[PDB]
Amino acid sequence: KNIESLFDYSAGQFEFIDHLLTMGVGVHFAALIFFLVVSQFVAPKYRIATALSCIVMVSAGLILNSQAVMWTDAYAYVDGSYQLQDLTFSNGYRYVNWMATIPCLLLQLLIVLNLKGKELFSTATWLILAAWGMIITGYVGQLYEVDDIAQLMIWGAVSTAFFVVMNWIVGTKIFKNRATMLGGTDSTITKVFWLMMFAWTLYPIAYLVPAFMNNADGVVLRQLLFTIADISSKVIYGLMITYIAIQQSAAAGYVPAQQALGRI
């Protein structure tokens, strides 16, 4: 049902996709070790924000690893090109994983925004429902990226509606609670908003690749966009969330955070 199954791949195309996914695994698990060791310098009220970055690193890294092995399982070098064998490759498993990773990314933002109590629970609930609506409708849409491009576009429009409403909740909460944030992170969090707008918009662009570049090079382009988007939306984003958590911890008087920032 996916455009990947339609083509043979040159050795160059096949190996580049394999290296993209493998490098993605290495970046996420390298960052996992960073978040783990820095978590001891985060104050208790923010420490779950850094733990969520560890959770996202392993979740994303495992999906990239699974995609890399599925890629090599599905194709073999036959008569001068990589050709589909008995097993299949699909991006649909990324969508299932977003059902978990996107709520984690959203929750760690709400934590460093200093939301608590009922506002935290209600904001998280609406954000997760909007995210799940976006993911599920996009998942259905990409089942038609070979058979029915018109249906891919309409499910994509519905998914984009959820996306825009989710981004509006995020922006409203960020610019409303920016004033509560300590240690100059009221400025940093505005950059986090724009990083999210940029990086998350790469995913719908990848989703439309079957509509504007339905060939083997488009398959490469989509994996390239996923790689840029994953590293930006999870790794760079998590590094900024962790910086904000540590900086607010130090401004709130958490001594391990003050000493960690002092030694750098």
Ligand X SMILES: CCCCCCCC/C=C\CCCCCCCC(=O)O
Ligand Y SMILES: *C/C=C(C)/C=C/C=C(C)/C=C/C1=C(C)CCCC1(C)C
Residue number, nearest CB to ligand X: 26
What residues does 76 pair with on adjacent strands?
83
Chosen from ligand X, Cl ion, ligand Y, none, partner binding at 233 (C-beta under 5 to 8 Å by type): ligand Y
Whole-angstrom distance, CA of residue 146 vs CA of residue 56? 31
Q: Which stretch binds Cl ion (CB under 5 A): 42-50, 139-147, 170-178, 235-243?
A: 42-50
Buried/exposed code over 135-163 (b: 16+ C-beta within 10 A; e: otherwise): bbbbbbbbbbbbeeeeebeebbebbbebb
Query: Is the separation of the CB atoms in 98 and 135 below 8 Å?
Result: yes
Whole-angstrom distance, CA of residue 192 vs CA of residue 175? 11
Query: Is the separation of the CB atoms in 24 and 228 below 8 Å?
Result: no
Residue 14 engages ligand Y in binding (rule: CB under 6 A): no
Residue 238 engages ligand Y in binding (rule: CB under 6 A): no
Query: For the window 133-172, what string marks contact with ligand Y as x by the rule CB under 6 A?
Result: -xx--x--x--------------x--xx--x---------
Q: Which stretch binds ligand X (CB under 6 A): 15-23, 66-74, 106-114, 204-212?
A: 15-23
Q: Where on the chain is the footprint of ligand X (CB under 6 A)?
A: 12-13, 16, 22-23, 26-27, 30-31, 33-34, 36-37, 40, 133, 137, 151, 154-155, 158, 188, 220, 227-228, 231-232, 235-236, 239-240, 243
